[PDB]
Design a binder for this molecule. Structure first.
Ligand code: A1AXF
Length: 209
């Protein structure tokens, strides 16, 4: 059972701006997704202080970066707090509406796309490099879900039947034909060292066949 939803107009406008604006410094997408992973791990770590049973779905707090040249995908996995169905469909997009307005205003005043994370909508920078994004996610209080969008104004949500994750979020970037540089070990290493060197969780860069 696959459910299709429309993005809110402001979010659709944000994604088309990210896809259509000429902007060469695309590598910032990785810093934004890693920063989102770090916040999600912070949240589960804090909640587990007053409720240790919240870690029964996995004690390890880490970030994995997995390239796959055959599938042309880059996957960012974290064992953070994960997202509920209400998050995927409603809450996160609603939160993002204010940050989207402030971001587009700042852009008209001189800011540039690399500052997108200052407005709380850094996740959508995935579309600087990805033609499609799949998010698999598992929150302690809900089921495992797969969210998916190739932009164009709509996204799908479905119950995920694949490998159970325990808890956390998997962002699968299906890269555009001309952005496969982000599948190379030395390029990812350079980006993580440049933008995410003080993240307080172990970041493991997987290597390929
Ligand atoms: F619903 C989706 F558009 C979506 C949004 C999102 N966020 C945007 C707001 N700030 C960070 C969290 N994270 C994951 C997803 Cl799958």
């Amino acid at each position: 059972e696959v459910e299709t939803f429309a993005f809110q107009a402001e979010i659709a406008q944000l994604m088309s701006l990210i896809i259509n604006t000429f902007y060469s410094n695309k590598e910032i997408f990785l810093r934004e997704l890693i920063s989102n992973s770090s916040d999600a791990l912070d949240k589960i770590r804090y909640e587990s202080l007053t409720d240790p049973s919240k870690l029964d779905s996995g004690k390890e707090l880490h970030i994995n970066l997995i390239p796959n040249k055959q599938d042309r995908t880059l996957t960012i996995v974290d064992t953070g707090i994960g997202m509920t169905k209400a998050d995927l469909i409603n809450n996160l997009g609603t939160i993002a509406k204010s940050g989207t307005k402030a971001f587009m205003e700042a852009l008209q005043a001189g800011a540039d796309i690399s500052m997108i994370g200052q407005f709380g909508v850094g996740f959508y920078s995935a579309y600087l490099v990805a033609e499609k994004v799949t998010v698999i996610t598992k929150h302690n209080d809900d089921e495992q879900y797969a969210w998916e969008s190739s932009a164009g104004g709509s996204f799908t949500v479905r119950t995920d039947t694949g490998e159970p994750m325990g808890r956390g979020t998997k962002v699968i970037l299906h890269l555009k034909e001309d952005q496969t540089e982000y599948l190379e070990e030395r390029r990812i290493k350079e980006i993580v060292k440049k933008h995410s060197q003080f993240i307080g969780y172990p970041i493991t860069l997987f290597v390929e066949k």
